[PDB]
């Protein structure tokens, strides 16, 4: 059988999380998952499912589960869904239209914001094209916004492509950090490896 307990703690309670442009992914497999316990393991401000009902997860078996995690601002959580547009969905992390999975988020102001600004979390602000679904672009090429070629140097109209969120504790919640975990539930014509307790 499968007998290991799925290692969600590894992803949900990582003490550091990725910048959204550099989002992390962990494949989960060969384990037993209890999604109700997971849901009542903390207080998620968002727990939203596509292609499946949250109430059924413990009855299903998947070929694999993937967990993508990162930090964004509160107001951008709405962008982590199929069919959305905006700087995050367009340039940093894009879900496919046929996505099947859950999007889970919670407010991480106590952890991720620093008095006079945490500048360590970054997002991609400029890009020549929109991401394809599940594209991961970590490049740092200088973006040419004007007529004048950049030759790889920050300048007038030549922009470093990543901007720091700078989370501060007294920000409005829109502009407070949220941790996000996206769980994709994959079904292929192959033996199931991730099941519920029954």
């Amino acid at each position: 059988n499968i007998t290991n307990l799925c290692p969600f703690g590894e992803v949900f309670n990582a003490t550091r999380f990725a910048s959204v442009y550099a989002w992390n992914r962990k494949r989960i497999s060969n384990c037993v998952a209890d999604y109700s316990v997971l849901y009542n393991s903390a207080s998620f401000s968002t727990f939203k499912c596509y292609g499946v009902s949250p109430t059924k997860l413990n009855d299903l078996c998947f070929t694999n589960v993937y967990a993508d995690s990162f930090v964004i601002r509160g107001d951008e959580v709405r962008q982590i869904a199929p069919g959305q547009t905006g700087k995050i969905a367009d340039y940093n992390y894009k879900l496919p239209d046929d996505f099947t999975g859950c999007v889970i988020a919670w407010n991480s102001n106590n952890l991720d914001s620093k008095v006079g600004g945490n500048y360590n979390y970054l997002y991609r602000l400029f890009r020549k094209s929109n991401l394809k679904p599940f594209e991961r672009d970590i490049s740092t090429e200088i973006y040419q916004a004007g007529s004048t070629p950049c030759n790889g140097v920050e300048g007038f109209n030549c922009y470093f492509p990543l901007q720091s969120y700078g989370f501060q504790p007294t920000n409005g919640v829109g502009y407070q950090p949220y941790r996000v975990v996206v769980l994709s539930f994959e079904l292929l014509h192959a033996p199931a490896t991730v099941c519920g307790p029954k």
Partner: nanobody
């Protein structure tokens, strides 16, 4: 049944660019993802980049920042890895690998079919 062929390896000079291609024969499905790995002398295999065929989506590992491009040539039907500024430290065995479905990763143990690997040696 699935067999993977790497093309483009061998002896290269520092400074030029390298184009490796991965050709996939006998796949039972079209919905799969293609990873590129290298193995430096005396180290573990490490993932560089992965391409999701369904989503047309490149996925770069932290180690591939700013030198490697992964893409698909729909004419040759290959998944290609381009390395731009060859240094002697680029000398290694490069492999391509596949996994089923559209989810890329650059982790060795997530792929089940491998090519034989191709020696790249930088002068």
């Amino acid at each position: 049944q699935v067999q993977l062929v790497e093309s483009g390896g061998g002896l290269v000079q520092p400074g030029g660019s390298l184009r490796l291609s991965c050709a996939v024969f006998g796949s039972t499905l079209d919905n799969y993802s293609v990873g590129w790995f290298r193995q430096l002398p005396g180290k573990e295999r490490e993932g560089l980049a992965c391409f999701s065929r369904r989503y047309g989506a490149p996925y770069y590992a932290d180690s591939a920042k700013d030198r490697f491009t992964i893409s698909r040539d729909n004419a040759k039907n290959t998944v290609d890895l381009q390395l731009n500024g060859l240094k002697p430290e680029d000398t290694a065995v490069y492999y391509c690998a596949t996994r089923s479905g559209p989810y890329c990763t650059t982790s060795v143990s997530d792929f089940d079919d491998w090519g034989r690997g191709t020696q790249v040696t930088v002068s």
